[PDB]
């Protein structure tokens, strides 16, 4: 039985978001790609450097916002600027969010030597698509 990126059925008491409720074979059929960039085109180079930077942001954003992160990030790369879209729960005071926003924008910009955009959308809780 296939087990790649799936949540198993357990009665009807475990909530599942839209991203986790679809099997990996539904990619490009029901859900899009969490990250979009030129590296994986047909005749374009510089694909490995984009991948490793993508993984670091998955680990940095998750640790920068402990517990308050809703689901996976969305990474958009236009020109030389990097846009990060996140869904964050209403956990920290708004003072701390702006502190982390300023801390993240400056630190990543001086590490990858490229401008970074960090846009946040706040939700009361995790959005539930099935079960519950």
């Amino acid at each position: 039985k296939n087990r790649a990126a799936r949540v198993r059925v357990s009665k009807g008491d475990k909530p599942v978001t839209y991203e986790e409720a679809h099997a990996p074979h539904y990619i490009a059929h029901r859900k899009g790609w969490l990250s979009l960039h030129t590296g994986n085109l047909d005749g374009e180079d510089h694909a490995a450097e984009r991948t490793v930077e993508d993984v670091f942001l998955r680990k940095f954003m998750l640790g920068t916002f402990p517990g308050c992160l809703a689901d996976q990030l969305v990474l958009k790369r236009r020109a030389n600027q990097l846009e990060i879209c996140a869904l964050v729960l209403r956990q920290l005071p708004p003072h701390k969010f702006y502190f982390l926003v300023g801390y993240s924008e400056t630190l990543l910009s001086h590490f990858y030597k490229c401008p970074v955009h960090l846009h946040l959308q706040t939700v009361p809780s995790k959005v539930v698509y099935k079960y519950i």
């Binding site: 990996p24 990619i27 790609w33 990250s35 085109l41 490995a48 991948t51 993984v55």
Partner: protein, 101 residues
């Protein structure tokens, strides 16, 4: 820390090759040409072999940058086949989808 001691040795091997990449190229040019006298070529073989062992392009090994699996690594993404599926099945790689035809 690199993920394994094997990965650490590869970094030193790549660094050593880069330093002696130009010197080896100049010496190897003499060997690979038959118009120079054979006496000079024999001296060239002694000098090129006197260089440190780690400064060899062939000894460079391509591993995965995440788990350092010596084989089963795609060259384009520099990732092992297990790690590549882990990122691709979650939709974290652009333009990568399950093949259906």
């Amino acid at each position: 820390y690199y993920v394994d001691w094997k990965m650490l040795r590869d970094v030193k091997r790549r660094k050593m090759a880069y330093e002696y990449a130009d010197e080896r190229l100049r010496i190897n040019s003499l060997r690979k040409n038959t118009i120079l006298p054979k006496d000079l070529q024999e001296v060239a073989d002694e000098e090129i072999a006197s260089l440190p062992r780690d400064s060899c392009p062939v000894r460079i090994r391509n591993r995965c940058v995440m788990t350092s699996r010596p084989r089963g690594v795609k060259r384009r993404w520099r990732l092992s086949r297990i790690v590549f599926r882990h990122l691709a099945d979650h939709g974290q790689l652009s333009g990568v989808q399950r093949a259906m035809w």
